Design an enzyme around this catalytic site. Structure first.
Site, short mmCIF file in Angstrom:
data_model
loop_
_atom_site.label_atom_id
_atom_site.label_comp_id
_atom_site.label_asym_id
_atom_site.label_seq_id
_atom_site.Cartn_x
_atom_site.Cartn_y
_atom_site.Cartn_z
CG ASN A 1 134.38 30.17 50.77
OD1 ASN A 1 133.64 29.20 50.98
ND2 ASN A 1 134.99 30.37 49.61
CD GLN B 1 134.09 23.10 51.06
OE1 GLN B 1 133.52 24.11 51.47
NE2 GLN B 1 133.60 22.35 50.08
#
Ligand SMILES: *C(N)CNC(=O)[C@@H]1CCCC[C@H]1CS(=O)(=O)c1ccc(OC)cc1
Length: 215
Positions: A182, A19
């Protein structure tokens, strides 16, 4: 209900993403759940676009954070979400540029797991597939996780600050865990994954804000 299952081995999970410096964890968690249901319904595994969610979900704050439920609701009302190819991730808040010609999937709502019930979360993962969950990931121990089943008595069940994806569950050396995907890149944790303590009094608030989309 199996005592262990790993959806990665079933081809329901796409590669680990990063991200970057944008608080879009909620978008990655949401697309992962949609990617799992898309695979289950069409037999095809494709990367969906978190940037579509970052830029277009008006009820969330883009790189400033958001809820997965709002993301599923947007996809439902928008009647679709683009593939990563049609709306690449840039890790910045930008104006909504949804392209209908690039639609890769849609959803028709979502269901929430009863708050704090890890047993219901287990049943959901087994029956539906990957589920979006929120946790406390502020501890140093979490940031530098390397191996084994993670458990820190300092983890908060009330301070939910990160969103991830539960892609399975099992037991390692007598310790029950959740297999968590994740969105901090493959260089983090165990190739982008972490095994979090299961049935240890809702460690890190794993079952406090879980949800999955309906197609
Ligand atoms: C991920 N990189 C940033 N974290 C989040 O967005 C958290 C996901 C799980 C739920 C809580 C989020 C943090 S927040 O409570 O500060 C938040 C909730 C809702 C928002 O907008 C609607 C914005 C932030």
């Amino acid at each position: 209900t199996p005592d262990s299952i790993d959806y990665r081995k079933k081809g329901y999970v796409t590669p680990v993403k990063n991200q970057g410096q944008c608080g879009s964890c909620w978008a990655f968690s949401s697309v992962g759940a949609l990617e799992g249901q898309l695979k289950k319904k069409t037999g095809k595994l494709l990367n969906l676009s978190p940037q579509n969610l970052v830029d277009c979900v008006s009820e969330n704050d883009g790189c400033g954070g958001g809820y997965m439920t709002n993301a599923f609701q947007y996809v439902q009302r928008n009647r679709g979400i683009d593939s990563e190819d049609a709306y690449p991730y840039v890790g910045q808040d930008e104006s909504c540029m949804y392209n209908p010609t690039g639609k890769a999937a849609k959803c028709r709502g979502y269901r929430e797991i009863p708050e704090g019930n890890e047993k219901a979360l287990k049943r959901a993962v087994a029956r539906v597939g990957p589920v979006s969950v929120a946790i406390d990931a502020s501890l140093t121990s979490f940031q530098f996780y390397s191996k084994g089943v993670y458990y820190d008595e300092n983890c908060s069940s009330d301070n939910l600050n990160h969103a991830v994806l539960a892609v399975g569950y099992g037991i390692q050396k007598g310790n029950k865990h959740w297999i968590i995907k994740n969105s901090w890149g493959e260089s983090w944790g165990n190739k982008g994954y972490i095994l979090m303590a299961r049935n240890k009094n809702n460690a890190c608030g794993i079952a406090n804000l879980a949800s999955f989309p309906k197609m």
